[PDB]
Ligand SMILES: [Cl-]
């Protein structure tokens with residue numbers, strides 16, 4: 015295979031490695047993916063030259079490109095060049111047919127032959143987060159390749175997906191003009207990935223930033239933490255559901271917790287009854303008496319989140335009390351105001367009720383969020399005063415992404431962005447090794463969120479009405 | 492001068508253009524400036540370094556310039572000394588360069604001064620690049636750097652730095668994308684309508700954060716109505732940060748009324764809700780919103796003129812108190828958040844709950860305006876105080892520059908009283924907008940090249956935050972472009 019190196023693959027691959035079913039594409043058409051494949055395969059560095067596109071006899075369909083077929087069962091096709099061998103086809107085109115670049119568009123045998131003889135330098139692979147029935151498969155990529163580029167996660171009504179590139183294996187004034195010493199972070203997330211458009215990299219980079227540059231200082235828990243202050247992350251909720259994929263995150267507890275905030279409950283038995291334990295330790299006899307709540311029942315958590323959302327300013331008594339018509343129903347008012355005046359700049363739910371702090375088991379961590387409406391899409395921004403990057407923050411991202419999607423449905427709006435402000439972002443010293451493993455993992459396409467579309471009031475959502483589809487993740491750490 | 496082009500200048504220059512005084516540096520030494528000059532004049536590209544291991548840069552001066560500059564070929568121009576301890580000497584510049592390039596293997600030639608040498612280099616177009624340390628203070632002197640020809644523009648700006656006695660930055664003046672990066676966005680493969688200072692390619696001045704946001708909102712913001720009747724271009728979610736140990740971020744691209752910012756802050760701190768307290772000091776920030784017509788239109792029909800309700804100050808000092816009117820005595824009532832958080836910082840700086848919140852949901856309806864700067868959080872690490880503030884509604888043209896300054900002063904005040912050094916101010920913008928009638932103003936502003944930021948000096952004797960007065964809060968070395976008129980809508 016002399017002179018047949020540097021061939022580029024384009025392919026779309028399901029989660030179970032299927033690329034074809036009965037000579038057809040095993041999934042419903044992804045228009046986006048064909049826009050992508052076209053754009054990549056027609057690009058000419060900046061007169062009438064074209065790129066070459068090669069496929070096997072099976073691949074049953076291309077404009078503005080040279081088409082080359084590999085068959086031993088046909089030598090004539092309308093419009094196409096035909097060859098019996100890959101060896102023969104590459105040598106011939108590169109000597110006698112003037113072109114820019116050669117792409118390989120498929121048949122498993124074409125891909126296996128291209129891969130087995132080390133003839134491919136680059137693979138543009140559309141990753142689909144779903145298994146599809148099939149009979150034709152993309153061969154395993156040899157350990158000789160790594161992913162160097164990742165796009166944002168996208169989605170259709172039936173799958174989430176992205177594009178990757180696999181490949182084989184700074185001017186002085188930019189340093190001088192910082193004003194600081196001219197002469198490398200101890201930790202870098204996925205150093206091999208050079209084009210880093212997956213939203214999850216926002217999170218990996220922050221982990222890496224805190225471990226590299228955070229100050230080791232103490233805190234209320236006893237265990238110390240590396241800490242740094244001030245970050246902002248954004249997630250496009252029209253596109254994907256930002257549930258982290260570099261480790262497995264379970265959401266059942268997060269969703270029950272959100273629903274419980276929405277019901278305005280301060281009763282921790284409501285969660286335990288569903289075997290949700292997030293809040294258990296903070297409702298126990300020990301923790302309560304230690305924090306001065308001698309006179310309160312176990313699992314009475316005080317006027318925390320849910321109380322503030324539905325009853326801000328009401329006098330708290332106990333978790334059994336009736337607070338209907340008491341205090342200000344922030345959540346209800348703000349949903350109403352979104353429907354009635356989407357341009358309002360005060361679409362805020364504040365849990366940081368300063369008067370009620372002394373009565374709370376834990377003062378709120380996600381203290382404050384604000385909605386925004388622009389072109390019929392709902393955005394949300396949330397302030398998080400204390401941010402556990404090891405264990406906490408990933409649940410918080412999902413929670414407020416789900417809430418925003420919930421509020422958008424009931425208000426008849428599309429989805430914009432969740433913007434998450436982190437104040438004291440920290441990694442506890444015990445988690446340094448878990449995190450080091452995490453930032454080394456290449457992220458999968460994010461999942462999608464599907465809400466029951468019949469639900470028209472925020473109070474009517476239940477756990478079955480909130481489904482995350484197509485969640486592929488690395489193992490739990 | 493055949494073959495005598497691309498000479499590179501390094502120079503340090505006062506606001507009045509003085510580079511020398513009695514053969515001495517006019518200002519107290521800036522060691523940072525020497526390290527900068529050193530690093531710039533001794534740098535060899537690794538390409539060249541590997542193919543010539545011992546190669547050095549050349550550095551030229553006239554006899555006058557009185558310190559050999561290690562790791563460089565020191566060249567010295569004179570007509571009155573034929574040899575110097577370990578240097579090359581020449582009658583004139585012309586021959587120096589010709590000889591150096593013909594017969595003395597070197598990497599790059601730098602011109603380190605004498606006015607006449609700078610003058611000769613500029614006049615004859617021999618220089619392609621100037622590395623200039625800008626000082627925001629005039630100093631007495633007798634040697635000046637020549638005016639820089641209109642043929643040069645600034646292409647790089649460092650962060651603003653400061654010493655005990657001046658603020659300064661570094662700039663570069665100069666004469667005059669891979670396909671996978673585009674494909675892998677997943678979106679269109681093929682320019683924003685507005686770009687701030689497009690000639691500046693290295694953009695480390697912090698003010699660029701604010702200038703880039705102005706351009707972003709103009710380029711991509713959505714025009715939307717609001718409660719003022721004047722519409723605005725609007726976009727959601729930004730974050731800016733300012734290093735308050737290096738400089739005070741008073742915007743330089745327009746003249747900002749510092750005095751009005753300070754009086755307003757002191758007014759918040761005292762917990763006052765009487766707009767007359769500001770008017771009595773000819774500060775008019777709040778006048779429109781305490782007016783009869785505006786109070787009545789928003790239902791505050793039995794309220795006294797310029798009684799603004801339980802806004803900011805009241806919330807900082809008396810959160811949860813019952814508001815009666817602006818004359819009522821509230822001492823002891825409500826929760827004194829400012830006092831308590833100040834106390835928490837001293838007692839336990841690693842507390843993760845150092846929050847002052849003005850967004851009192853129970854009091855929103857009694858307010859003239861619900862607060863725009865809702866909520867701020869303090870943070871300590873390495874004995875440095877940082878602050879993060881959430882602004883729900885951000886008037887980019889008029890309000891935001893005041894906010895940045897206001898909270899930077901506050902963080903400095905709180906730092907001083909807690910015995911802390913200075914960290915960062917971190918500004919979170921939610922609804923960031925440009926009103927339609929500020930569009931020309933801002934387009935003017937974003938083309939202007941930032942000056943180095945000023946410095947903040949607090950009276951060190953003040954130990955309680957309530958004892959600060961305007962004389963105690965000084966901003967030094969403020970250089971700015973002219974003011975830009977903008978209507979309050
Ligand atoms: Cl407003």
Ligand SMILES: [Cl-]
Nearest residue numbers: 234400843844
């Ligand atoms: Cl905490």
